[PDB]
Structures are given as C-alpha cells and as structure tokens.
Design a protein around this nucleic acid. Structure first.
Ligand code: CL
Ligand code: CL
Ligand code: CL
Ligand code: CL
Ligand code: CL
Ligand code: CL
Ligand code: MG
Ligand code: MG
Ligand code: MG
Ligand code: MG
Lengths: 224, 229, 224, 229
DNA sequence: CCGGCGCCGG
DNA sequence: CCGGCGCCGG
C-alpha cells in the first residue's frame, strides 16, 4: 500500500518499428536507443526530408522536446538511431524522426565524423550477421580552476532540452559463428576533424558503462 | 530478436522496509524516494549514529556511491527517507543509511531548514489519515551572461556523485473522506535561513513535475479527486 | 595421483548392532558413540559380567586399547554406549563391551553420577519416541601459574590409552510430534557427588561443540 | 534410523592445489598433510610474505584457528605443506598459508632445523622419480615424578589451538623401478641445534604410526615392495 | 557449510 | 546481480 497512488513514473521504454528506446524525462532525451542492423534492413525506398522531425506525443508535454526548442539554437536534431539504417520500411525510417530519438548535436559533428561513424556501422553488416547499435548521450564532468569537478551542459528551448557533452556508440557485433565483438566509441559534442581515423575515438566499454550508468557486458554474457 | 542480448538500462527500483526508491546510475543518486509515514512507526527504539552510512552493494560498483566519495567533499550524506521517520524497527531505520537513499547536501541545509521540513512532515501524521512523502533531488538550469541556460552541478568522489542544485519533497495527505491534499516544497541545496516559514517554500506541483521528469497528479487522480495547496 | 599410496587413514567409523562409533587411533578411544534409544530395546534377557570387556581386533594393534592397559591403573572401563541400554539382544549388549566403546573413567564417577545420568537417559524413552544419545570424551585445558593454557591428561598402559578430563553426553530428544529437544551434560572425570542434581551439570550444546570438535546443531537442522 | 539426523564428526579432508590434508577440529590442527613434490613445481615466480596467513573459513568457526590465536603466543605459524614446495603456481603457494596447513611451531625450529629438513626434502626431487611428503604434528606423553605418563601440550588463543610436542615428516621416495624407499623423521617442538645431521632424527616408521594413529606401511605395500631406511 | 561487517570491484 | 579481502561467527 506504499504505492496506493502508483509510483511517480519510472523507466520509459518505447518500442518503435526500427529501434527500442529508454527515454529520460528529466533531460527530455533518450538515455539510449538500440537498433539491430542487418543488410536487408539497409536497402529500400525509405526516404524523408532531412528536417522533418515531429514531436513524440507519447511523451508527456511537461517532458517532451519540440521543434521550437531547437529553433535558433544552433544545434542540429541529431538522430541517434540513424534514418539511413532503416530504408527497408517507410514506417521504420519515419520512427527515427521522432524527437525522442534525437539530441541537440553540434552540426559539424552531425554532418561529418558522427555521420562517418554511422556509415562505418552499416558497413560492418557485410561481415556480421547482426550489428546491434546502442547509441546515446553522455554528460561528462570537467575539473575547473577550483580543483572541483562539474557537469555543465546547456539546455535549449522553452522545455530545457539537454545538450549532451558527448555521444557514445556501442557496436555489439554478433558473428554467424556466435562470437560477440564489442567496439565502443565516444566523440565530444563539438566540431570533430573529419579526417581523424574513427579508431582513435574508440574507448573501453567500461569507461562508457561507468559514465552512462548503462551495462552491456553483464547483459552480453547472459547468453555468451 | 531486438532484445535477445538484453537491454543496457532498466528501471532501478529498490523496495526497502521503510521506503521504495527509483535509482539513477548516471547521477549515482535516487530519482525519488517514497515513504508512507505512519504515527505508529514514528516512535520506537531505533537508533544509529549520524555518520554511519553504508554503500549499497545492490548497485553495481560502477554507479554506486561510497563513503569515500563524500569524505572531504564538504557535503553531508543527506538521507532522503529520513532516519527519524522509521524508529519502530531498527532494520527499517538502517535502510535509510544506504547511500542510495542519500544525496550530497549542504550541511547547513541538511541540519536546519531541511530538518525542519522533515519534523513538520512527521507532525502531519497526527492530523491526516495517511502521510505519503516523495523526496528527491533537482538539477535546475540557470541563465548565464551569454544569455544561455545551463545545468551545472558538482560531482564528488572518484564515482562522480552528483550534487543536486535543489531538493523536492511532495506530501500526499489523506484527509478524512477520500480527499487528497497535495503539498510540494523545493529548497535550494544551500544554506537556508531557518527562520523563513516553510510555507514560503511551497511550489505548484507542476513545476516539480516539469523539472524532475516525474508525474504525481495523474497518478493520484486515478484515486478520487484532488485539492492542490 | 597425489594419493598413489592411499591416504594415511582417516575417520574410522564402526557400526555395531547397538551403536555407531568414531574411533580416534591417536588417543585409542572413541571420539563419540551414537545410540538410538527406544523403550523396547531397553528390555530383555541381555546380560554380561561387569568386567567382561574384550579388545577390538578391528582396530590396528598399534592403536588398540587392551585390558592390560587398564590393569592396575585405578580406572574403570567406562562404557560410553551403556550396556543396560541394550538388553533387547545379547549381541547388541555384547557389542558395548568392545574396548573401543570404553574410556578410562574414575570409578566413583562410573558407579554413581555417570550411572545416574544413564538411568535418566533411559527414563526419557517413556516420553520421547526416540532418545538419541551421543557420548564421548573431552580433554579440556586449564590455566596454570604461568598464565598459559594446557591440556593435560594421563595415558595408561603400554599403549598409552588417553584418560579423558571430562565426559559429555548429548541427548537428542525426538518427539513423536517432530519437536527435537537437546539436553547436553558434562561431568569431570573425577569423583562426583552422587547427590548433586543432574540438571546442574547441563551445559550449552555450543560449549560442547566448541571443545569436542563435533557439530550436532547444523546436523539436527538438516531435517528440522 | 540411527543416522537419520546426521553424524557429529566425520572425516575432515581438504583437497588443495598443492596438498591434501586431514583436519582435526579438537586440536584445531591438521592430523597430516600430503604433498607430491615435483621438481617442475619447485621453481617459478610464486611469492608471498612470510607473515601473510589466512584463516580457513571452510572450517566451522568453532574449530578454526585464526591469526589472533597466534598473535602474542610466541609461536610461529609453521606451515606443514611448505610454501617453497609450490612456487610454480601462486594459487598453489597461497594454499599453504591457510592456517589449517599450520601448527604452532617454536620459532627457532621453524626457521632452522625444520627449514633444513624441508630444503633436504626438495633436494630429493633431483634424485628420485617421485617425492611424497606426509607432514604432521605429534603429542607425545612424558613420564612424571609420580611415575605416571601424561600428554601435556599448550593451547593458544581463544580458540585453544594445540601446540604440538613434536612434528613428523615421512618421505615416500620412488626409486627407479618400483622400489619405494621410506624415510621418516621426528623433531621436537623446541630449539634444535642446526648443526646436528638430519639423519640423527630418523626414526622407525612404526613409532610415528604408533604415536600418530596413522598407518603408512600397509597402504604403500598395496603397491609393490618396501625398503625402510 | 553457510551467514555477516565495510570496502573494493566487474 | 555476482565476486573478492580479513575478520567474525553458528
Ligand atoms: Cl528495422
Ligand atoms: Cl512522460
Ligand atoms: Cl571530489
Ligand atoms: Cl540397539
Ligand atoms: Cl586402526
Ligand atoms: Cl593464548
Ligand atoms: Mg544525424
Ligand atoms: Mg538529514
Ligand atoms: Mg559405566
Ligand atoms: Mg616453516
């Protein structure tokens, strides 16, 4: 009866045709998005205007990002589950344009290195039976003049949509043979030199797990 | 086939003798703690030193606050479910010294105006049929000199435990019939003059809902009718 | 292959018609003996001369007590599983006269208080469906002038038969209803006033478990 | 129906990486430890401080020796399976610092003549096909002024850990064909002049068997023919 | 053989 | 959610 008036809401999972997502109403962004990439889901007629994002009415208005929040902010609507990953079905690609699957992203990053990383991810489907992609924001602390560590990020728009300090991407590469291989990257939410090799943004999965509060490694060895 | 190898981050609920909490591994802090204050439960022989907190090993070490994180930080280990709310059962009281029921709190606040809000909450068990207390942190943005808004909060210890900018306490009060009276408070994580009446810190529940990402009103209203104070 | 030449021998259990026993070849006595007492096993024709003990040829001669070891020592051959507990079968009472079921016992104790304790044990079978009796020696330390603790006991005979410093008896009273009740006693191997109430020699089972190296309480709660 | 509620005291064997032991809960000490010394296993990078023993929690607390028992006792924690017999594998070597492989040993003995007997044992792995070492304590009676014999040994610590009066080491040596050569030693738990040749401490195996309650000869002879030294 | 403590840890 | 450490403990 300690829950007579329910519980103040907990982890909001959303199942879309092309990804699953854990929403953070506090930041008005996804904590993570999970895609399962295969070669056939990568081809097809699916298309959409680059700027055609719509708000997620399944998120309460108190905690829902809107297009107006992005207006004049200088940030792209960076999709986490990328639209080109889901050309196989117009509905499946449409679902990537919900704002709940986007985060404020510095435009030079969205167009260049972060895009490059997505291209790379799709290429690994020629070698791997399944490329699971888990994408999400990070908010990483910094030490200031006073010796103290602070998390500092801008919030944009009326609804204070959090602007991540970095993005992570975890590739869970499922071999046809059953070997699972992990490649995880972090890039700062900042203009990133298009010519730095993607490999140099690799980080140990554990540094990502530590910062994000997510765990993949115990979940992977559930059936490994 | 999309979750065949698990999901990275699920609802981190914890049911204790004295409260229910939802835990946030990114902040290493609860999102909210829920108690039902009964007057029966307010008196008893439960006691524990003020400085005797335990890390919560039910949280993976990567996201678990430890006592080393607080040491030398300048912050009190501020319990969200208050110790003195559960004196009837020592186990009930010990549960409040799990660090997952704690957040860095400015000591003058923890020991004064936040303490006074707790004592006032216990007082309402005398005058209402049920007192529910939902307590939690806030991280509220501020507008800076360039005109832009930013959330800025300190993190302490090797585990980067987040220092809240504010705290909220929502009282769900059961009047005689089926009337629920809501009463919500915000205090800044800062020295708060003890002499300011607690009613000066009331806020519309909606602002706590908006800022916290939590929802109280639709949950309560599926259970009669409401009188926001 | 770390056991190519076997193992230097380990815990010697013996199953007799009337008790089971764990033998200690180091002391040439039983570590414990276990009887299961019931009212019908207490009646019958079984009899034997009080002094008619025979040595246990199932024990190696190096570690086997003999009658000659007892000769002139001033100690009775105290039976642990008591002969009167097993009148129902001559073989079953005979088995109690193996020296492996005896220990050197001060005679005034064997005749009086220790005997009284055995009488008491048999009486509890009118109330309890099973009276399990576990009997054995203790060797308890003493502090001397130098502040140090020492175990000191005489050994008798050519074969150095250890003379216990005390005896324990644990009664495991099995109710018909399933309640198990424990009564455990310790008496010093010394002349004991026949008129002290048996209750005053009760001790917590744990003090017996600690000294002896036996455990009953975890074994009792195996099926309790 | 006679063991329907269990037996109070069974064989307390322990299999470790580096030895097999039989444990005695009354004495809180091993009855014997059995190793097979291979030369391969004698060299490696295994190391551990001389003072870094662990209590063996596989033994019930009521009968388990702890480091507090040895502290201030004046006795070395004397390992029976020697550390330097298992340098190939750190886990193998760490197993010898379980206190259930230890007995109170007079320091001058542990660090000198008993050490020399161990080094000599390792030396025999060069000259024999297999070296088996069985090591253990003794509690040997003494005749007193009243003409009667008594075993008297100190017990140390709150757990009353028994100080042996002597120690035995039995070497089972595999000669070229199938010949086993037996070689058994006794030293008193006391300062032993390091200069006395180790052969002066040989004894007939039978005396160790008689005193210890252990049997070696019939076990070996079910495996060819024997040459007692 | 279990259980615990505070602390560390994947 | 498990695992560990030394120490305590039934
Ligand atoms: Cl898809
Ligand atoms: Cl919502
Ligand atoms: Cl810090
Ligand atoms: Cl019988
Ligand atoms: Cl034997
Ligand atoms: Cl001592
Ligand atoms: Mg993009
Ligand atoms: Mg407080
Ligand atoms: Mg008798
Ligand atoms: Mg040594």
């Amino acid at each position: 009866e300690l829950a007579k008036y329910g519980l103040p809401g907990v982890a909001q999972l959303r199942s879309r045709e092309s990804y699953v997502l854990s929403y953070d109403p506090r930041t008005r962004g996804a904590l993570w998005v999970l895609e399962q990439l295969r070669p056939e889901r990568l081809r097809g007629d699916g298309d959409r205007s680059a700027c055609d994002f719509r708000e997620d009415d399944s998120v309460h208005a108190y905690h829902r990002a809107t297009n107006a929040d992005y207006r004049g902010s200088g940030f792209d609507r960076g999709a986490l589950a990328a639209a080109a990953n889901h050309r196989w079905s117009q509905r499946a690609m449409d679902d990537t344009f919900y704002l709940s699957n986007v985060a404020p992203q510095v435009p030079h990053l969205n167009q260049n290195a972060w895009n490059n990383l997505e291209r790379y991810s799709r290429s690994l489907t020629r070698t791997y039976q399944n490329v699971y992609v888990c994408t999400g924001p990070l908010f990483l602390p910094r030490t200031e003049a006073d010796g103290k560590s602070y998390v500092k990020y801008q919030v944009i728009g009326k609804n204070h949509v959090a602007v991540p300090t970095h993005f992570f991407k975890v590739l869970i590469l499922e071999a046809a043979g059953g070997q699972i291989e992990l490649r995880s990257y972090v890039m700062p939410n900042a203009p990133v030199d298009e010519t730095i090799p993607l490999e140099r943004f690799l980080v140990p999965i554990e540094s990502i797990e530590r910062a994000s509060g997510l765990l993949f490694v115990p979940n992977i060895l559930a059936r490994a």
